[PDB]
Design an enzyme around this catalytic site. Structure first.
Site, short mmCIF file in Angstrom:
data_model
loop_
_atom_site.label_atom_id
_atom_site.label_comp_id
_atom_site.label_asym_id
_atom_site.label_seq_id
_atom_site.Cartn_x
_atom_site.Cartn_y
_atom_site.Cartn_z
N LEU A 4 1.01 -1.25 0.38
CA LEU A 4 0.06 0.29 0.09
C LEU A 4 0.75 1.23 -0.06
CD1 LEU A 4 -2.03 -1.54 2.46
CD2 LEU A 4 -3.72 -1.11 0.96
N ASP A 5 0.36 2.57 0.17
CA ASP A 5 0.88 3.63 0.20
C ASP A 5 0.93 4.17 1.57
OD1 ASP A 5 2.37 5.95 -1.70
OD2 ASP A 5 0.70 6.76 -2.21
N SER A 6 1.53 5.29 2.07
CA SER A 6 1.55 6.10 3.01
C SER A 6 0.47 6.78 3.15
CB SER A 6 3.02 7.16 3.19
OG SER A 6 2.83 7.52 1.65
#
Ligand code: MYR
Lengths: 79, 122, 99, 128, 155, 65, 459, 177, 87
Positions: I41-43
């Site tokens: 996933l992303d930050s």
């Protein structure tokens, strides 16, 4: 102590205005990542809340029936 | 509440000033006017312990209503007819006050018309 | 960038030490070892005795001295009867009815 | 556009609007590292003096004693009488006194003159 | 305690300033003493005049109520800037805009109250007609003297 | 017992609070309707306010001029 | 007054003959017995003073001060018997000897029939207080405070001596009864100007007047608890009693003379109170509160109206008791935390509930909560000064804010908030401290029922 | 700015802080859940518009203008959690968090009614006073010249060794006394 | 009033909130899954997930602590140490 959570299959995106928000986002080209988390608020006993006029008129039917009964009793007890 | 508009936004020389009113003598166009009558004797109206603001011309109905409030305890809603009678007498007094206001307004308007007649005649 | 192993190990160690202390806060069911030590009383021991005391203190110590307790004279209406004198008030004037 | 924040004496500028926070120069990096090292050394000293089982008492804070002695006893040895201190002492030390004295003398003279000519309402004033 | 750990006079040359910064445990550049106006501040540094509310509460402080670490050289007026006293936190609106808005609002309302006091409202009726010469006897008038009687007539 | 907690659903409600709320709402509506049928004066109008400008001239004492 | 002096002169060998472990108990028992016998001075009249002989007399003014003095001395012995537990037996007995000599000096000073005897006894009260301050004080610079106190008192009181001897040589006597019956008006001359200044400046120094109050924020701090109590609760009232006696002799010049001095208080008690808003030392805050109360006393005495006199004596007694209790509270907290910094010890209610209750009661009695004696005195002073002039109500009313604005502040920072972490030597409340504070507080709440004995000589 | 472990906030931390505060303020301004979800999706799209950037200066004043816009469009009364500082229930029960060392000042009459708990407390005190020496020995050697640079503390290294300076964290008072 | 919570219930509720996420799947979601390494996933997804648990449990987690809650077990650990579980 320990509370057992219900099944997660029942929380569906449909039945809400959340799917309308989601399709408007898809019309602009996005997607809703939290439909199921907020889907509990519109499903179950909390669905179809009353409006303000429904809130103000709470208990009006039985109150009106008792008013009619009481005014008839006091209209017939004067004789 | 159009009297404020007729007094303030129009001209102030035709509408009466409630601070100083009436400015005309009572015996203007009124042959053998009558005097409003007291019913309660001043001693009977004094020992009833009435407030000085309440000691107007219609204190007799107030005395009757206070007596009915005293005797009909604890049925506080038993004799509201006397309260209605006192309210009706107060309403009639307010009607007479408003009639005095209209008479003062008409007399001031007639004085303005007389000075208009003098201006356009002499 | 998550936890480095040093701070993760420190937080884990402090975590089970804190949990050990937290469970150690619990008491045994034997504790505490405490040392070994009429329906209408509330309407009598609080009400009637002060009523008697205040009534006596007012009847024979307060009202004896002058002007300590001042009573407003009662309302008298036309047509009333006075117990102390017996002279009945005459009725008021005949009402000029309006309605 | 937007209404730019104008700082005052009682409304400080927000920290995220500061240009100096957005500086990536090396000197700011060594300044931040040095103040972090100083704060870490002081914190280490505090929790070394704090977690001692043998100690049962007050951990001495030198900064608090320094602040109290700067506020209380070190104000007169570092005072020089100059024109600014003289002006601030003349404006605040004797000005309110002479102003209050003049207004009270005027009021009391007026009251005495009104009383001695018999015009002030003093009919029921028997407590003084 | 000892004498050279205590505040002294105002330093002038660089090495006295470095010694003061060592004593006050700040950097030699962050140590900015008060100007020598002869007021008595001594060598006490000038903190940036910020309230303790401005400090981050999520930081773990040695003194959580004051948000001050142990041995941290406090402000010269720290008792003014405690959390129960004068603050300097930023506001959503500008300060001068706040002041002019409040002053204009209260001045406009006071002017409206003045022009309403000058221009009253009433009901177009006459005065309250009272008996017995406008109630002379009940108002405290002396019964021995007979004032000018007013008489209220029908209408 | 007490009311057991529930997860993402309507809490369990007994009969007492429901009948209490319904009875009090009915009492409020009956009281206001009965007081509106009995009095009907302080809210709708008590006394006829006469028109000020419609008074006849002969009873207000202004000579014809 | 030879029925009270001889018991103290017999208390002197009573503390010079006891064992090393029985000095405190015997002295406390016998001083409390003398305090019990002290109530016989209340046989007063509304029109005459109780005179015993040619040298001693006591009207309804000096009697509450006497009762307060020889009630305060046993409290002093309780308050100062713990921090001297490490001292030598000879020095402990010397401390008790100085306290007993000071009590004897005060009870001889308050009943002085003639004014010269009052003056010499008034200056004789200097010696044990100075000895206690310069010997048993804790901080380093106590010598400066002792020198300042002694020199302010002496430089005030020597022109008082010159004026008193001049008055005695002029008219013929210095008896207060004779001067009550042989009083002469003083005209508005510069000789009478300097006579008024010489007769007043000693008492304005010891009250202290604002401007000359600088001997209080030092000598009230570095002194021990007994010296702090005898400086705060007696000697200022000694100066007030002297000013009350003297101001009879200086009419009608004061009516145009006391304009600056009154107003030198009428502004000063504002800003000194503001100093309590920004004080880091609790004992200095208590001392400045005492300064404000004594400035109110100065205004009340100098306007010379009857209600002002009643308010002055009532506020004198109430403020003396309250300031003694506050000084005891400061001493107890300083003993527990070993620092006089107010910001250091926080959250003491979570550790000391009874001490927090005593703090609340002392702070409430300090802000003139009715129907305590302090509210009665300050209210009478406000009525009298409003009779004097109108606008001065502002100069009192704003003080009504600021007093609360520090006193409850003193209640907040020391009691309310998160407690300090590194302070872990807060012992539970000693029975001695609780006994001392109850003995300070309960007489005030009992005299709130019957204040008619402490309302002055002309009630 | 002011952090315990790091001496500065990087660009990523500033962006994430701005995003979280913007989401909180947007949830405050958009009380109803569906409006909040729609505008949160819009704000996420706006943030992902400039996610892939290669110039640091461009990201710098883009973040400056974004923070200025967030300051302009903030809620004057943002929603604050009850336990967060500034909330209605912040540090309330901190008034009841009596420290443990006061238990060392109890009377023996009131210490006799909790025997087992005070025995376990005595065991914990003995453990602390036998672990203090080896924990300060561990912290002495691990500390480099000039003291520690960061506020982070080293963990337990040897078996049977407790972490250094552990008493005033492990025996901190409970949240609900 | 104010019922106590157990650590098993804590991880049950955290996995319940995680399992309703549309950028995640309910198959390979586990209690020792790294969000970007083992899950991908992303930050932005990380801070938004932290905000989701902040709304779920009704209290605010600061950003300095929020950057390190990187696995579901670490989130359970932070909730456990905050709410004083196993008393
Ligand atoms: C003329 O208007 C006479 C009535 C009294 C003065 C005006 C009062 C206006 C406010 C009350 C009425 C509001 C109606 C919406």
């Amino acid at each position: 102590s320990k509370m057992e959570l219900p099944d997660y299959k029942q929380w569906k995106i449909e039945g809400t205005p959340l799917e309308t928000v989601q399709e408007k986002l898809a019309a602009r080209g996005l997607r809703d990542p939290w439909g199921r988390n907020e889907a509990w608020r519109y499903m179950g006993g909390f669905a179809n809340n009353v409006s303000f006029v429904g809130a103000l008129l709470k208990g009006f039917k039985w109150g009106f029936a008792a008013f009619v009964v009481a005014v008839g009793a006091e209209y017939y007890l004067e004789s | 509440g159009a009297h404020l508009a007729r007094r303030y936004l129009g001209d102030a020389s035709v509408e009466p000033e409630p601070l100083r009113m009436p400015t005309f003598p009572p015996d203007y166009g009124f042959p053998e006017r009558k005097e409003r009558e007291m019913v309660a004797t001043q001693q009977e109206m004094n020992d009833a312990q009435l407030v000085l603001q309440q000691r107007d011309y219609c204190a007799h109905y107030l005395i009757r209503f206070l007596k009915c409030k005293r005797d009909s305890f604890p049925n506080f809603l038993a004799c509201k007819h006397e309260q209605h009678d006192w309210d009706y007498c107060e309403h009639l007094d307010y009607v007479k006050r408003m009639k005095e206001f209209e008479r003062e307004r008409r007399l001031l308007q007639r004085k303005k018309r007389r000075e208009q007649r003098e201006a356009d005649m002499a | 960038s998550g936890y480095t192993p040093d701070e993760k190990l420190r937080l884990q160690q402090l975590r089970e030490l804190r949990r050990r202390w937290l469970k150690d806060q619990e008491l045994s069911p034997r504790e505490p070892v405490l040392p070994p030590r009429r329906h209408s009383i509330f309407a009598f021991t609080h009400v009637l005795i002060p009523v008697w005391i205040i009534h006596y203190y007012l009847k024979y110590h307060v009202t004896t001295k002058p002007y300590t307790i001042v009573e407003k004279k009662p309302r008298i209406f036309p047509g009333d009867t006075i117990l102390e004198t017996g002279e009945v008030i005459p009725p008021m004037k005949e009402f000029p009815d309006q309605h | 556009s937007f209404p730019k924040y104008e700082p005052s004496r009682l409304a400080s500028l927000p920290t995220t609007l500061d240009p100096a926070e957005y500086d990536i120069s090396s000197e700011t990096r060594k300044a931040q590292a040095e103040r972090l090292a100083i704060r870490s050394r002081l914190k280490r000293e505090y929790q070394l003096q704090y977690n001692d089982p043998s100690r049962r008492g007050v951990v001495e804070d030198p900064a608090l004693i320094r602040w109290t002695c700067a506020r209380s006893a070190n104000v007169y040895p570092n005072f020089r009488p100059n024109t600014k201190t003289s002006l601030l002492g003349a404006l605040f030390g004797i000005g309110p006194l002479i102003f209050w004295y003049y207004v009270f003398k005027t009021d009391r003279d007026r009251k005495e003159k009104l009383i001695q000519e018999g015009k002030l309402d003093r009919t029921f004033n028997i407590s003084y | 305690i000892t004498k050279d750990m205590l505040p002294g006079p105002y330093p002038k040359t660089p090495e006295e300033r470095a010694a003061a910064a060592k004593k006050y445990n700040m950097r030699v550049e962050d140590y900015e003493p008060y100007p020598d106006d002869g007021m008595g501040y001594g060598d006490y540094p000038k903190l940036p005049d910020r309230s303790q509310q401005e400090r981050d509460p999520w930081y773990d402080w040695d003194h959580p109520d004051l948000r001050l670490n142990w041995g941290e050289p406090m402000h010269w007026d720290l008792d003014m800037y405690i959390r129960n006293r004068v603050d300097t936190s930023p506001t959503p609106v500008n300060w001068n805009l706040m002041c002019k808005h409040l002053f204009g609002f209260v001045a406009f309302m006071l002017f409206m109250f003045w022009v309403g006091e000058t221009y009253p409202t009433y009901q177009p009726v006459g005065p309250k007609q009272y008996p017995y010469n406008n109630l002379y006897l009940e108002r405290g008038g002396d019964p021995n003297k007979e004032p000018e009687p007013v008489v209220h007539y029908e209408i | 017992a007490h009311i057991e907690p529930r997860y993402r659903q309507f809490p369990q409600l007994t009969r007492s609070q429901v009948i209490q709320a319904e009875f009090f709402s009915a009492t409020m509506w009956f009281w206001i309707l009965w007081r509106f049928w009995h009095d009907s004066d302080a809210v709708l109008g008590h006394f006829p306010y006469p028109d000020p400008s419609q008074w006849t001239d002969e009873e207000l004492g202004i000579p014809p001029d | 007054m030879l029925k009270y002096i001889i018991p103290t002169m017999m208390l002197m060998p009573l503390t010079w003959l006891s064992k090393n472990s029985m000095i405190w108990i015997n002295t406390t028992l016998h001083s409390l017995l003398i305090s019990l016998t002290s109530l016989l001075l209340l046989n007063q009249f509304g029109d005459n003073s109780l005179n015993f002989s040619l040298t001693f007399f006591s009207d309804s003014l000096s009697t509450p001060l006497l009762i307060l003095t020889m009630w305060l001395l046993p409290l002093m012995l309780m308050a100062s018997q713990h921090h001297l537990s490490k001292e030598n037996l000879a020095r402990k007995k010397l401390f008790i000897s100085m306290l007993i000599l000071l009590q004897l000096f005060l009870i001889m000073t308050f009943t002085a029939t003639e004014l010269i005897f009052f003056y010499i006894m008034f200056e004789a009260t200097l010696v044990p207080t100075l000895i206690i301050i310069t010997r048993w004080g804790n901080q380093t610079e106590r010598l400066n405070a002792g020198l300042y106190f002694l020199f302010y008192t002496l430089a005030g009181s020597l022109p008082l001596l010159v004026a008193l001897i001049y008055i005695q040589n002029t008219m013929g006597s210095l008896n207060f009864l004779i001067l009550q019956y042989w009083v002469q008006p003083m005209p508005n001359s510069w000789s009478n100007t300097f006579m008024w200044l010489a007769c007043m400046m000693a008492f304005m120094v010891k009250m202290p007047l604002y401007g000359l109050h600088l001997w209080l924020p030092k000598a009230h701090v570095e002194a021990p608890i007994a010296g702090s109590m005898v400086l705060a609760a007696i000697l200022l009232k000694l100066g007030g009693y002297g000013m009350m006696r003297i101001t009879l002799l200086l009419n009608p010049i004061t009516d145009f003379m006391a304009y600056p001095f009154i107003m030198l208080s009428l502004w000063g008690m504002i800003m000194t109170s503001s100093i309590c808003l920004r004080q880091t030392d609790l004992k200095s805050l208590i001392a400045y509160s005492s300064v404000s109360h004594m400035a109110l006393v100065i205004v009340a005495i100098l306007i010379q109206t009857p209600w002002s006199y009643m308010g002055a004596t009532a506020l004198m007694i109430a403020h003396g008791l309250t300031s003694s209790m506050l000084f005891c509270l400061a001493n107890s907290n300083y003993e527990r935390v070993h620092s006089r910094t107010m910001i250091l010890a926080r959250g003491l209610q979570t550790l000391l509930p009874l001490m927090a209750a005593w703090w609340l009661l002392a702070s409430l009695t300090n802000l003139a909560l009715p129907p305590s004696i302090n509210l009665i005195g300050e209210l009478f002073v406000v009525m009298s000064t409003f009779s004097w002039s109108n606008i001065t109500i502002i100069l009192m009313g704003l003080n009504m804010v600021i007093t609360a604005l520090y006193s409850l502040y003193m209640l907040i920072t020391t009691q309310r908030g998160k407690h300090t972490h590194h302070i872990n030597n807060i012992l539970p409340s000693f029975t001695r401290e609780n006994a001392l504070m109850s003995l300070h507080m309960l007489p005030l709440l009992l005299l709130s029922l019957n204040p008619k004995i402490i309302l002055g000589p002309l009630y | 700015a002011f952090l315990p472990s790091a001496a500065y906030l990087t660009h990523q931390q500033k962006v994430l802080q701005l995003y979280k505060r913007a989401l909180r303020h947007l949830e405050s301004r958009c009380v109803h859940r569906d409006k909040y979800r729609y505008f949160a999706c819009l704000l996420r799209a706006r943030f992902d518009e400039h996610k892939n950037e290669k110039d640091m200066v461009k990201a710098t004043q883009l973040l400056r203008e974004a923070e200025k816009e967030f300051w302009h469009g903030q809620h004057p009364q943002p929603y604050i959690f009850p336990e967060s500082p500034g909330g209605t229930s912040y540090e309330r029960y901190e008034c009841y968090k009596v420290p443990e060392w006061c238990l060392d000042d109890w009377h023996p009459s009131e210490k006799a009614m909790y025997p087992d708990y005070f025995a376990k407390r005595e065991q914990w005190k003995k453990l602390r006073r036998e672990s203090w020496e080896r924990e300060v020995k561990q912290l002495q050697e691990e500390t480099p010249v000039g003291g520690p640079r960061t506020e982070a503390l080293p963990p337990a290294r040897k078996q049977g060794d407790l972490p250094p300076l552990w008493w005033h964290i492990v025996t901190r008072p409970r949240e609900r006394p | 009033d104010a019922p106590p919570l157990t650590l098993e219930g804590i991880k049950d509720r955290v996995l319940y909130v995680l399992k309703l996420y549309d950028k995640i799947d309910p198959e390979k979601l586990s209690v020792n899954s790294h969000f970007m390494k083992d899950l991908g996933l992303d930050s932005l997804d990380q801070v938004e997930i932290i905000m989701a648990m902040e709304d779920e449990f009704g209290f605010e987690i600061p950003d300095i602590d929020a950057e390190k809650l990187m696995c579901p077990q670490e989130i359970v650990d932070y909730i456990a140490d905050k709410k004083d579980v196993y008393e």
